[PDB]
């Protein structure tokens, strides 16, 4: 009974972007900042609808990272949310199945930063904890992303990505992961 | 009778992706590498068609850069091409008008790397030579992108200082 649509940010209306913001604010219970919203704009949105009402969302952002010394094209997962009264029905799983398809068609590696509880959902669609060190840019130089190690997860089904290598992410505002 | 379509890489049929490869190889007369092709995948494609034949293309890739110390979200233009026999009919201009729309809706700044004899097209839809320093990552440290200074152009729908420094994100091949 839930319909799924994949739309680029450039294909959304202002009202649809606003409904997305509203869904994220309500679904994260105050844990979602203006920088977090910036992070979810510019790539592909997978949106779940009950009739015309938006009830679920995940976005896939293109990021450009280094894996040890090697450049790697990343599909970075942002702003995963399902409206509270619609949870535990499998919507989040369906959103990730669509997310995996987009990543497989476009990028060398999927990455996301998960809450300690939220890891089971991603693990159930094949994602694994990233085992290597994580780095981010601060004032133009790389530092260790100590707080994120153990929480970042990756995916590339049937690929040859070394999950024990270091990742060096690209720069943004707010949380870099 | 040229039709324009905007399609994410994830929405391209396999037929469209192969047609795109051929169009780029034929249109750039040998100066388009496998890294250049990797660079045009992962974002939005604006494609021009004569009936069912692909005859023009431009892609807009999301990149994450620094403007001086400030993080900025960039729409980066890649793989601009029109099949030779279709050129000088305004297709490239229309591709760029569509590109400007996509950038205005998604990103803080448009950037591209133009050839010395190929800046007039972008200038005619509002783009300007970037006047500040350009930097790229090598060995995980930023170095100057001297080659590109005077060739990279930017566009803001806007309050952006074109004399500020740009620090791009990492990739294979040409960083710009
Ligand atoms: C995380 C989130 C998006 C999951 O959305 P969801 O639609 O509830 O995800 P699913 O329903 O596919 O699976 C969720 C759980 O319900 C369970 N479930 C799904 N369908 C079920 C059913 N018919 N009967 C019983 N349990 C079911 C799944 O097994 C899973 O259990 P697990 O937590 O042990 O894996 C949602 O809780 C949310 O929006 N949280 C707030 C924002 C947030 O934390 N986002 C993620 C940041 S990492
Ligand atoms: C650059 C390129 C994409 C332009 O495609 P195009 O469709 O020819 O672009 P337009 O036709 O809109 O404009 C092209 C020229 O014709 C002129 N023109 C525009 N409309 C015209 C018309 N209706 N009749 C005649 N001339 C016209 C433009 O002013 C421009 O003149 P300039 O060469 O002095 O800028 C094409 O030359 C190409 O594919 N080159 C090879 C790949 C390449 O170099 N890409 C860009 C790298 S920066
Ligand atoms: C896949 C996804 O949708 N991800 C969302 C994006 C959203 O924009 C953001 C809103 N805030 O939340 C998630 O991403 C956060 C992570 O939640 C956060 O993790 C901390 O918070 C968790 C829950 O409190 C703790 O479990 C965890 N140990 C702790 O490190 C990371 N540090 C940064 C990362 N951007
Ligand atoms: C907007 C656009 O579609 N851009 C294409 C992308 C394409 O993937 C690539 C294929 N190769 O070409 C263009 O982008 C190149 C630039 O052409 C190149 O410019 C050098 O080559 C020019 C022509 O010889 C010289 O004029 C110029 N001085 C010289 O620096 C830059 N260094 C790197 C940059 N990725």
Author numbering:
A (entry chain A): 2 to 178
B (entry chain B): 2 to 158, 160 to 178
What does the paper say about this structure?
AAC(2′)-Ia is chromosomally restricted in Providencia stuartii, an opportunistic pathogen responsible for catheter-associated urinary tract infections with a high mortality rate. This enzyme is a part of a larger group of AAC(2′)-I isozymes, which includes five enzyme subtypes (AAC(2′)-Ia—AAC(2′)-Ie). Specifically, AAC(2′)-Ia utilizes cosubstrate, acetyl-CoA, to detoxify naturally occurring aminoglycosides such as kanamycin, tobramycin, sisomicin, and gentamicin, as well as semisynthetic aminoglycosides such as dibekacin, netilmicin, and plazomicin through the addition of an acetyl group at their 2′ positions.
Meanwhile, the crystal structures of AAC(2′)-Ia in complex with CoA and acetylated aminoglycosides describes the enzyme in three product-bound states. While the aminoglycoside portion of acetylated-gentamicin only hydrogen bonds with AAC(2′)-Ia via three residues, the tobramycin moiety can interact with up to 7 residues. In identical fashion to gentamicin, the central ring of tobramycin is anchored by two hydrogen bond interactions, N-1 with Glu149 and N-3 with the C-terminal carboxylate of Trp178. Additionally, both aminoglycosides interact with the backbone carbonyl of Ser114 at their site of modification, N-2′. Aside from these interactions, the prime-ring of tobramycin also interacts with the backbone carbonyl of Asp32 and the side chain of Asp37 at the N-6′ position. At the double-prime ring, tobramycin interacts with the enzyme at its N-4′′ and O-5′′ via hydrogen bond with Asp117. The tobramycin molecule in chain B also forms an additional hydrogen bond interaction between its O-2′′ and Glu148 of AAC(2′)-Ia. The acetyl group modification of the molecule interacts with the enzyme by way of the backbone amine of Met81. The acetylated tobramycin in chain A also interacts with the backbone amine of the adjacent residue, Ala80. In the tobramycin-bound structure, there is no chemical addition at the N-1 amine, and therefore Glu148 can adopt either conformation.
